[PDB]
From a paper:
Bin2 (also called BRAP1) is a putative membrane remodelling protein whose function is unknown but high levels of mRNA are found in leucocytes and leukaemic cells. The N-BAR domain of Bin2 is positioned within the BAR domain superfamily of membrane remodelling domains alongside the N-BAR domains of amphiphysins and endophilins. One such association occurs in a subgroup of BAR family members that have an additional N-terminal amphipathic helix which inserts in a shallow manner into the bilayer and induces positive curvature, that is consistent with, and stabilized by the BAR domain architecture. These N-BAR domains exert both intrinsic (amphipathic helix) and extrinsic forces (BAR module) on the membrane to promote changes in membrane curvature. Taken together, these data suggest that Bin2 is a bona fide member of the N-BAR protein family that has an important role in leucocyte morphogenesis.
The structure of the predicted Bin2 BAR was determined by MIRAS using a native crystal and a Se-Met derivative. A dimer was present in the asymmetric unit and the general architecture of the dimer resembled an elongated banana as found for other BAR modules. Each monomer was a coiled-coil, formed by three long, bent helices. Helix 1 comprised amino acids 38 to 88, helix 2 (from 95 to 159) was kinked in two places, at residues Asp119 and Gln131 (labelled as K1 and K2 in Figure 2A), and helix 3 (residues 169 to 238) was disrupted at Pro196 (K3 in Figure 2A). Different conformations for the extended regions of the dimer wings were observed for each monomer in the dimer. Concretely, the region between kinks K2 and K3 (amino acids 131 to 196) showed different conformations in each monomer and this was likely due to crystallographic contacts. The movement can be described as a lateral displacement of helices 2 and 3. This does not affect the curvature defined by the concave face of the dimer, which would be consistent with a scaffolding mechanism for membrane binding, where a defined membrane binding interface is needed. The overall fold of hBin2 BAR was very similar to that of Amph BAR consistent with the high sequence homology with dAmph and hAmph2 (N-BAR sequence identity of 37% and 62%, respectively). The concave face can accommodate a circle of diameter 170 Å, which was slightly smaller than that of Amph due to the way the protomers intersected and the distinct helix kinking. The dimerization interface of hBin2 was smaller than those of dAmph or hAmph2.
Residue numbers in the entry:
A (entry chain B): 41 to 238
B (entry chain A): 39 to 238
Amino acid sequence: ERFEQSANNFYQQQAEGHKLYKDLKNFLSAVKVMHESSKRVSETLQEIYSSEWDGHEELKAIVWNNDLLWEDYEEKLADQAVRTMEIYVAQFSEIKERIAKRGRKLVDYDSARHHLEAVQNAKKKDEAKTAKAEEEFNKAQTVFEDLNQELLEELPILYNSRIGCYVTIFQNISNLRDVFYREMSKLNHNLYEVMSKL
Amino acid sequence: KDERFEQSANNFYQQQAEGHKLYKDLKNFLSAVKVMHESSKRVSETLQEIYSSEWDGHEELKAIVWNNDLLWEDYEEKLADQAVRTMEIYVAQFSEIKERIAKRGRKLVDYDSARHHLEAVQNAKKKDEAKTAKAEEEFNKAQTVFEDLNQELLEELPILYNSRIGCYVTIFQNISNLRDVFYREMSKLNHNLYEVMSKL
């Protein structure tokens, strides 16, 4: 009951992180498509503009700086948004497995329970294998107490981390975009001036 | 003669291939804007879903996402009219031109055959005919028909060739002007977003 709804918490958390991660991944790669299409255009432009015409050199530098700006914007997005999501969502495969192993080690603890009520149900009916049962149950309890006690504190910590990570991620994007726009703005002006000189 | 023509025809073929290509990269560019638009919309919808109406900034976020969407849209409509359809009006002039040049090639074939079939008829091999004013009337007509047309094009092609410069200026100044507002509006929204997320 307490778990099943907490695990329930963790799954909605997983599905949500996974939808976000996917959306970010799509965005990155729309940035690459936007980059690509801008590179093609400035090359056609670089071609249709004669090397004799004034500003042909400044045109060369715009095409170049356009590119270094897309590349840099793309790279930083990949680190600061996509990779950060990947670090974040990796936590979910580890936990899915930790919950798989907690489902087992409690089946063991319960059978080493089942087995020690039927080795000790024997006052003088028991032989040698009596402390071997008590040692077993104790190893099955310590195994499950660690995994469950450590799992019981870890899930909610992880659930509560979700907002901080979304916040870090979206400020990182805004910072990158802020700079990218400002820089692109300068080049946009330079582009107009070069053209105005034909 | 058909050699100022050749250079003018060269020039035109460069211009036409240029316009076709720029036209394509401009259309492609607009696709990619739409792809960005889309991808951003999908990002902001997941963010809206995550963002609780029980939270401060929720309404402002609903406006960011909203205006964000009107910007992309406006920008797309305007790139369409000012860059893509501006090129469409421009490259479209190339149909008439290409059909007039293909037509001027036929008429120079009308010329070249006339020159041949006048020269057999006429040439002192003792079978002259009192009335081949008829090979004269035709092959007079062939040359005046081809020379006029050849002439027309020698006037049109440079006028049109040279106009490529204004088109390119126009189109890139349009885009540049458009980008200027778009970056500035996008910046504001990008800040609001930064602020709206830093309250969480």
